Subunit: 107 residues, 3 copies
């Protein structure tokens, strides 16, 4: 199963990286005075959510979880100015994500 | 073509039922203490609620779809036993039972 | 039927209800018990609590990785504590039972 790989290798790699903490839970727009955030981002997403979806049999298959990881990154690129701290962090994780996703087994 | 039944019970059936206006009585167990109904757990031997059915889908409890379906049936039939026809609680259960039966008819193969 | 479902619904359920389970239903709180050495001696703590959260969220690659955890829990107990101790006899009762139930494992 590919879902096992995503939970046991991909997610675990990403979650232990030093740059993970901003994406381990939803962006708290309230704490940060961002009333624009949830208006600009209509599908918010995080490794918080992806984790619990993997642990609670939410996905139809692996490719829906992959779509969630892409959304999480692109959300970050949509809201934030290019080349900010936070954007570079997303890119480091996205590069690491694409590497890990190539070794994905088949069935 | 290749769809799992339990997935569908989760992503489609439970999800539809959960959002519906009349869903809240059934989203957690019936609280005997809060209502002072010390007879509920005597009369209703196997209690059940969408909240439990949800944890069971989320945590690999059920053996097959039949078993999840039966807990649905049980929740409704429990409610119909304990409360007497005409009550709002029963009408609400009757609405969700109908809808359940539609969504069950679309189930994978 | 499936081997992971068996472990969850039969093996764990039986072991969980049993009277000697309570010390193995959560980690060994080395803080509460003033046991500085426990996490130096026992390099992989394990307990039925953690196994359950593992079976319920989708941790295990296969049934054997669940079984190695059950065996770890028992041997961790046999290592840390002295033979004869109450806690050991409890684990021995649970081992006997665990093994009985594993002989009925599905094909
Ligand atoms: C604000 C911030 C400062 C920093 F140094 C590093 C990060 C990651 C920062 O971003 C976050 C910090 C904490 C949190 C918490 C944990 C509260 O949910 C979220 C973010 C944050 C996360 N993600 C994924 C984002 O895409 C964007 C985030 N933060 C946007 C942000 O707060 N921008 C400020 C807003 C005010 C501006 O005048 C100055 C910049
Ligand atoms: C009591 C009640 C009043 C109401 F207007 C609407 C509902 C759904 C009501 O039922 C419940 C309200 C709250 C809760 C909580 C959330 C506390 O578990 C449960 C019920 C309830 C839910 N289900 C599924 C049931 O089968 C039965 C429930 N409750 C029945 C009940 O309380 N009956 C007595 C019987 C005599 C009446 O004159 C006074 C109320
Ligand atoms: C200490 C104890 C006394 C007792 F009468 C029965 C048991 C099972 C006992 O062991 C435990 C009691 C509680 C807990 C909690 C729940 C808090 O994590 C754990 C244990 C315990 C569990 N398991 C599985 C172990 O392997 C070891 C445990 N603990 C043993 C322990 O603390 N030993 C000390 C060692 C020093 C001695 O002077 C006093 C006894």
């Amino acid at each position: 199963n590919q879902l096992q790989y995503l939970l046991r290798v991909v997610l675990k790699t990403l979650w232990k990286h030093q740059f993970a903490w901003p994406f381990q839970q939803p962006v708290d727009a309230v704490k940060l005075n961002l009333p624009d955030y949830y208006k600009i981002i209509k599908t918010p997403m995080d490794m918080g959510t992806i984790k619990k979806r993997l642990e609670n049999n939410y996905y139809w298959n692996a490719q829906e979880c992959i779509q969630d990881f892409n959304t999480m990154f692109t959300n970050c690129y949509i809201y934030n100015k290019p080349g900010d701290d936070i954007v570079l962090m997303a890119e480091a994780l996205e590069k690491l994500f694409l590497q890990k996703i190539n070794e994905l087994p088949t069935e």
